[PDB]
RNA sequence: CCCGGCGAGGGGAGUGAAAAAGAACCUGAAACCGUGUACGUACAAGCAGUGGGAGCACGCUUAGGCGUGUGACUGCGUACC
RNA sequence: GUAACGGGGCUAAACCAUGCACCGAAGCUGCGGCAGCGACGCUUAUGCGUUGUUGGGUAGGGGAGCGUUCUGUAAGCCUGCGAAGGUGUGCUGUGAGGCAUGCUGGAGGUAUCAGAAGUGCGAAUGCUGACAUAAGUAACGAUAAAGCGGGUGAAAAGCCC
């Protein structure tokens, strides 16, 4: 019979309208942002998130390098001798050990530099 | 209050007069003219008796005297954008806005 | 609780010391830039900032691959138009070891900050001791 | 509505849009793209269904009600003063309840 | 003759920079008691020597 | 009279 | 009653449940423009967000690396229809 | 404007052959959860534990929902110990949503399941009104310009002599 359509107004707006990290102008003011900001993070948070266990992967893996290569031989050769290892053998993320334990990490070293064949 | 003396409308701009009232602030209230009675055009006078208000407005509702005070806040506001119509040539639009602001002035103390 | 390895803000850096005269060129670039990032630094995700001093000497000597001496050219380019454009030689720019045959490494990291004053870290010079003016605290 | 005259603006020049029609249902007045007139609503139902499976009241509201007596009338002509008397009757109160 | 974006709020005072007017730096004048203009001596009657106008 | 206090009298009676 | 020009307008005072109800008057959203405060900002390249993420401002847990505005710096990365 | 490796640079950081190592995608795997769908156990409308498995997707097909207004519901219920509309915050679901609550508001609101559609907006060079912006910019309408003195006046280049 009526709608006034009106009171699902703000209330469908305001609804993304929060969406104000500034941003910026409106990008956060109007409906600029409509999606075409916040549907915007709103897909790059998938990808640019979903990204990251690739973007901590690469970064331990720096360091691991960095440490064994730095007693000799390089992560190449190195997760060689660990991999060849059965109960014997973690992965990264903790071989991060590195950096806040180094003996820890250079005694890995060894079991891993010794396995080698 | 704090003592308060505001106008409503007047009559020219926002900015125009945002300008003026911002050698006002900060010290004050004794500086109120010498400033304003010096420093040239029109917005600056629409402010030399609102200040002339918000001081005889605190030897009333206040009764603090004309020495003290500092003048805390200023700020002029967009008061209702005034609106008529041009000639031109043709016609086409003249959308002439006769532009107005609030002024409201604070004066108080340490 | 949740991993990554913090770094400060730095909170470290060095004072080491390189000749360069053996003719090892541009190869010498390379742990002159990742140790300028952290390469035998196994300690301090880089990423974000990091660092970490060297000095380099002379480098008026760096034999250059094979041919590469006579005819490695450089080109600047004023921008000022008028037509720019400045061919110029290994041999003719090792008439001058300043910003450039050392700084064949500024363009083997990152660029934009970070990798802009990461290389400011460098320092030149060119005849080792004698006129090593810099800092005399302390290197390797 | 008071649709009255055809065409405002030209069709083309002055480039503000295809403009046609005070009334237009786009437009700020009149025009209702659809809506209508009085018009039935009212259903048809067949007899076997009316008639169909009607009272349950002593099946589901089965508690409630299947009551029989008789139907009132001691009950004078026209008063109510007291209807109340009678709806003690069930002292079952003001209870929606109705009669036949 | 004509621009094809909006010149945000951002750049609105990006002009507007310079502005914000500067006042005074006034003084007084032996005679009056602290008003003359940066040039003109006394306000308060009018003079500077003496018979400025009209005075004592 | 303290020549804001001053500014006043000379004025607040250039009316009476 | 006070400032004002025997103006606008406004400050006190009265009314009144309320004047944040003052007559341009109920509620008073949005676009848009000011005043206050906090972080950011004057070697820095792009749809301006994302993942990191320091540091400061702030409230915190008889640590336990927390909430909040901020966001240097660094991986991607050319709105929609 | 180098500009015919993307670059820095490589005499190997090029090429042929050979071989181990590793990096690498949402692929696969592991693990916590969602849904559709055949099986095992169990109960037993059922579900639920597990389990095989499937879920890129425009034209379009099909299937569940979300909320807006009115309707009996109903002289029922909230409501001046403050309803509706605004405004903050919190929790919760796949979602459209919801619930609670501070503040402001000054009478109204409407569970439950049923029913009716003036049922949902960013786009239509869409109608309407409000506000931006170029922007304190170009412009003050005939280059027959004026200058001084007095008056009244809050103020005078522009009115009065
Ligand atoms: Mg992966
Ligand atoms: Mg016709
Ligand atoms: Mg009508
Ligand atoms: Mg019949
Ligand atoms: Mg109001
Ligand atoms: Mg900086
Ligand atoms: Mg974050
Ligand atoms: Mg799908
Ligand atoms: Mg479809
Ligand atoms: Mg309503
Ligand atoms: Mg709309
Ligand atoms: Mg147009
Ligand atoms: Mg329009
Ligand atoms: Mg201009
Ligand atoms: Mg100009
Ligand atoms: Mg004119």
Redesign the interface.
Same mark, same amino acid.
């Given at each position: 019979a009526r709608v006034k359509r009106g009171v699902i107004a703000r209330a469908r707006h305001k609804k993304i309208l929060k969406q104000a990290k500034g941003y910026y102008g409106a990008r956060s003011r109007v409906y600029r942002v409509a999606f075409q900001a916040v549907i915007k993070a709103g897909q790059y948070a998938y990808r640019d998130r979903r990204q990251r266990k690739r973007q901590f992967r690469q970064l331990w893996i720096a360091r691991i390098n960095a440490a064994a290569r730095q007693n000799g031989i390089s992560y190449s050769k190195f997760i060689n001798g660990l991999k060849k290892a059965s109960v014997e053998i973690d992965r990264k993320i903790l071989a991060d050990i590195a950096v806040f334990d180094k003996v820890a990490f250079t005694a890995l070293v060894e079991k891993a530099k010794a396995a080698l064949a | 209050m704090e003592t308060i003396a505001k106008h409503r409308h007047a009559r020219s701009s926002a900015q125009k007069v945002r300008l003026v009232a911002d050698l006002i602030r900060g010290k004050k209230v004794s500086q109120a003219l010498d400033i304003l009675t010096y420093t040239n055009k029109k917005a600056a006078v629409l402010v030399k008796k609102v200040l002339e208000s918000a001081i005889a407005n605190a030897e009333h509702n206040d009764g603090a005297d004309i020495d003290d005070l500092k003048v805390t806040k200023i700020f002029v506001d967009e008061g209702p954008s005034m609106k008529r119509i041009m000639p031109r040539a043709k016609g086409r639009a003249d959308r002439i806005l006769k532009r107005t602001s609030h002024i409201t002035v604070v004066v108080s103390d340490r | 609780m949740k &991993?990554?390895?913090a770094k400060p803000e730095t909170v470290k850096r060095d004072w080491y010391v390189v000749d360069a005269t053996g003719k090892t060129l541009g190869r010498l670039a390379t742990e002159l830039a990742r140790r300028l990032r952290?390469?035998?630094?196994?300690?301090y &995700?880089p990423?974000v900032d990091t660092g970490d001093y060297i000095i380099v000497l002379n480098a008026d000597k760096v034999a250059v691959t094979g041919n590469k001496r006579t005819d490695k050219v450089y080109y600047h380019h004023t921008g000022h138009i008028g037509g720019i454009k400045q061919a110029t030689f290994e041999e003719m720019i090792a008439r001058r070891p300043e910003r450039v045959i050392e700084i064949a490494v500024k363009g083997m990291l990152p660029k934009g900050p970070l990798g802009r004053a990461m290389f400011r870290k460098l320092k030149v010079y060119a005849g080792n001791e004698h006129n090593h003016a810099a800092q005399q605290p302390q290197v390797l | 509505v008071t649709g009255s005259g055809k065409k405002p603006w030209r069709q083309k020049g002055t480039g503000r849009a295809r403009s046609g029609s005070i009334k237009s249902p786009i437009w700020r007045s009149g025009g209702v793209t659809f809506a209508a007139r009085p018009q039935d609503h009212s259903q048809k139902v067949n007899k076997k269904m009316y008639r169909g499976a009607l009272k349950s009241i002593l099946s589901e509201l089965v508690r409630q009600d299947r009551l029989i007596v008789v139907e009132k009338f001691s009950v004078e002509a026209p008063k109510t003063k007291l209807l109340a008397q009678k709806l003690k009757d069930m002292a079952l109160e003001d209870v929606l309840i109705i009669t036949g | 003759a004509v621009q094809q974006n909006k010149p945000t709020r951002s750049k609105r005072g990006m002009r507007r920079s310079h502005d914000a007017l500067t006042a005074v730096t006034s003084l007084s004048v032996d005679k009056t008691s602290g008003e003359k203009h940066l040039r003109h001596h006394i306000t308060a009657d009018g003079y500077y020597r003496g018979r400025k106008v009209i005075a004592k | 009279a303290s020549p804001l206090k001053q500014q006043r009298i000379r004025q607040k009676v250039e009316k009476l």
């Open positions: - | - | &991993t990554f390895t952290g390469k035998h630094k196994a300690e &995700t990423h | - | - | -």
